Amino acid sequence: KPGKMKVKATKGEGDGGITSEGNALYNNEGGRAFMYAYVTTKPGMKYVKWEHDSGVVTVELEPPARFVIDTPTGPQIKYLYFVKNLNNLRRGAVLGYIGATV
Amino acid sequence: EIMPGKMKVKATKGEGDGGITSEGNALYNNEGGRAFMYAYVTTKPGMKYVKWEHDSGVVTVELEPPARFVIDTPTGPQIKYLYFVKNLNNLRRGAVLGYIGATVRL
């Protein structure tokens, strides 16, 4: 199941009211959307407000890792923010999904 | 760092104890220095080993008991068997699952 990774466009927030657009990478482990990571162009993000029907959770982000994607004009850097306390299995699923897609 | 999640596929052959044989894909990383097989995917249960070429050579790579998963095909769903190599760490197992999820129609 960790393999069935899905992407949802979502806003990120950081100190001082700064914001980003980006994608949450997430998995429906048994009928509840579990965010694993957030990817964006922008540094300094701290959290994402993540929607469940039961209500919104603010998901805290680790310090980001920088990574490379391919573009029409060459490599560009994006930031990958794992959710706090994500385990190694789920981190690996994020990296594998990214490696296969970007 | 996406390096440990980076993955390539190579067509290869598996074996189980009692003469069992299979064809399938090895998922491996050759991140920088050597080829490191992470997993083997095939259509058959009961595989125990994969015959991994390296050098020129053939290496026998031991497998964990498989997880079954299902893919869409032109003729409908097909059961596949995912065998991690023995003692693959959780980060790398996760990388295998993420890569399969990204590339296969599950």
Curated annotation (Swiss-Prot), chain A:
Domain Nsp9 ssRNA-binding, first and last residues per copy: 1-102
Compartment annotation: Host cytoplasm, Host perinuclear region
Protein name per the record: Non-structural protein 9
Native species: Human coronavirus 229E (HCoV-229E)
Residues of the full protein shown: 3829 to 3930 of 4085
